[PDB]
Amino acid sequence: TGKLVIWINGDKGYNGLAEVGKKFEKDTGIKVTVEHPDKLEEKFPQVAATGDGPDIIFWAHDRFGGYAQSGLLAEITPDKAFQDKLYPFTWDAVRYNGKLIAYPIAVEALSLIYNKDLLPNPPKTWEEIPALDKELKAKGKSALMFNLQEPYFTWPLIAADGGYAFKYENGKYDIKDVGVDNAGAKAGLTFLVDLIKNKHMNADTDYSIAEAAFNKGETAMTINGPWAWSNIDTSKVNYGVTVLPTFKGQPSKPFVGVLSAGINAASPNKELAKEFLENYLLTDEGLEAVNKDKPLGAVALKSYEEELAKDPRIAATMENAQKGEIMPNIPQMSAFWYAVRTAVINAASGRQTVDEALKDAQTRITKGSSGSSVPTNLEVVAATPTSLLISWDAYSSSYYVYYYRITYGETGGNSPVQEFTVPGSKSTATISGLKPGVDYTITVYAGHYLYGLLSSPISINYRT
Ligand SMILES: [Mn+2]
Ligand SMILES: [Mn+2]
Ligand SMILES: [Mn+2]
Ligand SMILES: [Mn+2]
């Protein structure tokens, strides 16, 4: 409680961040320790409460969803004046169930990268690309090569004309609303597949081949993110970075990643963590200190971004991000990647129509129950030596839940798990006939009147 421990990845400007921490110590006498363990994103949930977990954790926003579901992150409380300092869209990356759970720091998205010596005026639309490729092939070059294997790289086009992963509305994901097979995703993927069948691109092109071709001066354009610029710099190609082309007049929709800073829910230093983040780090001066150490790319703080965007590669990054799709931070996004990978390979190879390929992907992604269930926090409400009463937020369940299955057994010790059921009108259960002295793992499942037992139970450890 005398201090602030910060975790940040070892490839980030943690020495710049330590300088900000030293200025904070100079103004407050609070010592700020910046650590950069490997695998920090796996370690955090294991050490958070309490021992030596950090007060503040910096990571891509997409992991913070899982942390928040687990109750590991404090709800943050920036005032209106602070909220206005960051681009509004970046705040949508750090909500979980409508509550703010982190501060946006930096923003990444794919851009169009072009060889100025081959193409001083890069295309404004995807539609111009076939004609440009024809004119370049007659000169032994291609217009465009980019990684086609990963949906992260093909999504910007697929989704441009109205596709989306999960609908985001009223500050939350509507997980039942997926936009993988709508008419927009179909137009996008049809255009992509047509480029490939017409030999404007090769269906086998992957990250390495695209990067090699561009850096060797063989292709006029590629699609890649800020992490690739220093590699291009070693090639001496005269390159530019610009807004992705439009499709059907609509912007490409790259996924947006936001490096974010979360405050540990178990931290006794939450107000100091807040002061540090809002009043020291998230200033022109604080972000510059980090950036000087290792560049952040585009940043969420408007004043400092205005300075950084004098580098048009950063201005392009931010513009592609403002037009893009925030990467969903919900667990159901896990199914997206392999589903869309399959769709794209099958459509591109001509194994399936675009329509059937995306319909199969949409099916595989929506695979998951209609309704909400229990997330719970602090379950055990009463105890005797041999008996305990548990409690869960049954009110969180949809009306489809008609029962709860309670399981309890020996913690660690691989023993017979006991189980019983209660009606869905019930929000508590007494467990009894237990040994006064051992660790128990109590777990509760929701039962749906159609699907039966649902997959995301609530589980706690207790001791009598
Ligand atoms: Mn470093
Ligand atoms: Mn045609
Ligand atoms: Mn160079
Ligand atoms: Mn400034």
Swiss-Prot record:
Induction record: Induced by maltose and the transcriptional regulator MalT. Permanently repressed by cold shock in a PNPase-dependent fashion.
Key word Transcription regulation present: no
Pfam families to which the protein is assigned, alphabetical: SBP_bac_1
Similarity comment: family membership: Belongs to the bacterial solute-binding protein 1 family.
Matches recorded under NCBIfam families: PRK09474.1
GO molecular function per UniProt: carbohydrate transmembrane transporter activity; maltose binding
Source organism per UniProt: Escherichia coli (strain K12)
A GO-annotated cellular component: maltose transport complex
PANTHER family in the record: MALTOSE-BINDING PERIPLASMIC PROTEIN, MALTOSE_MALTODEXTRIN-BINDING PERIPLASMIC PROTEIN
Function comment: Part of the ABC transporter complex MalEFGK involved in maltose/maltodextrin import. Binds maltose and higher maltodextrins such as maltotriose.
Principal place of residence: periplasm
Subcellular location per the Swiss-Prot or TrEMBL entry: Periplasm
InterPro entries xrefs: Maltose/Cyclodextrin-bd, SBP, SBP_1_CS
Keywords: Periplasm, Signal, Sugar transport, Transport
Subunit composition and interactions: The complex is composed of two ATP-binding proteins (MalK), two transmembrane proteins (MalG and MalF) and a solute-binding protein (MalE).
Gene Ontology biological-process annotations: carbohydrate transport; cell chemotaxis; detection of maltose stimulus; DNA damage response; maltodextrin transmembrane transport; maltose transport
Ligase recorded as keyword: no
Name this polypeptide is given: Maltose/maltodextrin-binding periplasmic protein
